[PDB]
């Protein structure tokens, strides 16, 4: 009907998945045991859960997700959480060996003998489903293992199906922070392998997330609980269109068909304006005009790219909760009149607006307050070229000194890909300025 399959590959995807499904169960009112209260919504798998959970004759809402993990520690922990009876046993595919930060170790030595099992899972989901709109793949680029095995699974799913969308989130490598030094290598390898197969790859950065945290959450020492909670609420917002109803509606297929301009370039950015705390929402007040202004304030976006150093071309606004369309269209018109912003010629129309009436929900004991109006903002602009500029004048030095290539070649790799990736990236940036200019 209207459903998507969730895949989480990794170290990098386990905690965010934990948070997001906790929010899902909380908001639909699932008890972490799995069933409903005396209210009558258990059925033939067709009610609001029919999009996310496979509640079957057993009466338990079963998530339609698979986690695959190379290092069994964290997956044992997640099974030793509380929602274990909720989750499906062999949808929790665990291994015994890490990919050890090596792109080619992940992609070649260990991955191939796991793709059979993961394919078996996904096909036994593909038989039961009927709508199969697409997948939600969670991984990273600064991942020790979320890189290579993820690339391989992407390749197999692309070659078997080219008839469904492919949505990717990513915690992007930090621009100036690098926990790993194999980060640039395996990251660019992932990028150049995935460019010709990815439908919509989106990014977000931990440093800017923290910057928001101590800016307006009034949290100078947040945590993962908080970071993952924020990202989970973001994805909840983007799936609200599927779950609830509304006046005018858009779908992820519309997202793809209406945000990417050309071939190749499909990496936009996202934001959520009303990030405030209990007392803040208490004796303050939000409204459409200032949520627009805040969501387009240059710092509020979660990547360090200055819009005045770039030029806008596409924007999709998702408002959720109560709102009238008058102020919406009026405020976006005023922003059109704004003189600090920059629109390229190609897009006299560039605003895809989508409304859902249902208010966003809170998590108990968490940080975010009650929300009356909320917005997810998805913008694409030329600005992000500087990040790849950074990555290339980083990687060039390591290649000049042929650093750390011994590991990869000893486990059996050759210069070909290492050379190719640099001009793949170079083609990417050159296209960036070619389209940015007029």
């Amino acid at each position: 009907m209207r459903e998507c399959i969730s895949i989480h590959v990794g170290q990098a995807g386990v905690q965010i998945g934990n948070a997001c499904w906790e929010l899902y169960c909380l908001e639909h009112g699932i008890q972490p045991d799995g069933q409903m209260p005396s209210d009558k919504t258990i059925g033939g798998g067709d009610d609001s859960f029919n999009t996310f959970f496979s509640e079957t004759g057993a009466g338990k809402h079963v998530p339609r997700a698979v986690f695959v993990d190379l290092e069994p520690t964290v997956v044992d922990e997640v099974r030793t959480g509380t929602y274990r009876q909720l989750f499906h046993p062999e949808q929790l595919i665990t291994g015994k060996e890490d990919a050890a930060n090596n792109y080619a170790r992940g992609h070649y030595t260990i991955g191939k003998e796991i793709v059979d099992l993961v394919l078996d899972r996904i096909r036994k989901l593909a038989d039961l489903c009927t709508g199969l709109q697409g997948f939600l793949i969670f991984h990273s680029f600064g991942g020790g293992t979320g890189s290579g095995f993820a690339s391989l699974l992407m390749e197999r799913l692309s070659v078997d199906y080219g008839k469904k969308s492919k949505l990717e989130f990513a915690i992007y490598p930090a621009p100036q922070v690098s926990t790993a030094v194999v980060e640039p290598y395996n990251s660019i390898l992932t990028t150049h392998t995935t460019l010709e197969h990815s439908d919509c790859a989106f990014m977000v950065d931990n440093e800017a997330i923290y910057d928001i945290c101590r800016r307006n959450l009034d949290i100078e020492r947040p945590t993962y609980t908080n970071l993952n909670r924020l990202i989970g609420q973001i994805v909840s917002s983007i799936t609200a269109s599927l779950r609830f109803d509304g006046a005018l509606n858009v779908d992820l297929t519309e997202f793809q068909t209406n945000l990417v301009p050309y071939p190749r370039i499909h990496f936009p950015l996202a934001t959520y304006a009303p990030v405030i705390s209990a007392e803040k929402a208490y004796h303050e007040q939000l409204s459409v005009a200032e949520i627009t202004n805040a969501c387009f304030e240059p710092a509020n976006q979660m990547v360090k790219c200055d819009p005045r150093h770039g030029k806008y071309m596409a924007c999709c606004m998702l408002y959720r909760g109560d709102v009238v369309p008058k102020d919406v269209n009026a405020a976006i018109a005023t922003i059109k009149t704004k003189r600090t912003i920059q629109f390229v010629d190609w897009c006299p129309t560039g605003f895809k607006v989508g409304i859902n009436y249902q208010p966003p929900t809170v998590v108990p004991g968490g940080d975010l307050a009650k929300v009356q109006r909320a917005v997810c903002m998805l913008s694409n602009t030329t600005a992000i070229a500087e990040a790849w500029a950074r990555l290339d004048h980083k990687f060039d030095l390591m290649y000049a000194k042929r650093a750390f290539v011994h590991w990869y070649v000893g486990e059996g790799m050759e210069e070909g890909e290492f050379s190719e990736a640099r001009e793949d990236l170079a083609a990417l940036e050159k296209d960036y300025e070619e389209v940015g200019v007029d």
């Binding site: 059925g43 033939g44 067709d46 004759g57 057993a58 009466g59």
Partner: protein, 50 residues
């Protein structure tokens, strides 16, 4: 099944609540069926034997 179609545009396949079936069904040597034993009536009962 007519009521099943009395729901919306598309059908949905309801079924019997399996909870009752587990908590009430003969397993092991423990039966769960009870048995009553009586005589048929007519105007003048003849095969009262069975």
């Amino acid at each position: 099944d007519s009521f099943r179609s009395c729901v919306g545009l598309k059908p949905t396949p309801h079924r019997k609540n399996f909870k009752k079936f587990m908590e009430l069904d003969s397993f092991g040597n423990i039966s769960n069926i009870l048995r009553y034993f009586g005589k048929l009536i007519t105007h003048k009962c003849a095969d009262v034997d069975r």
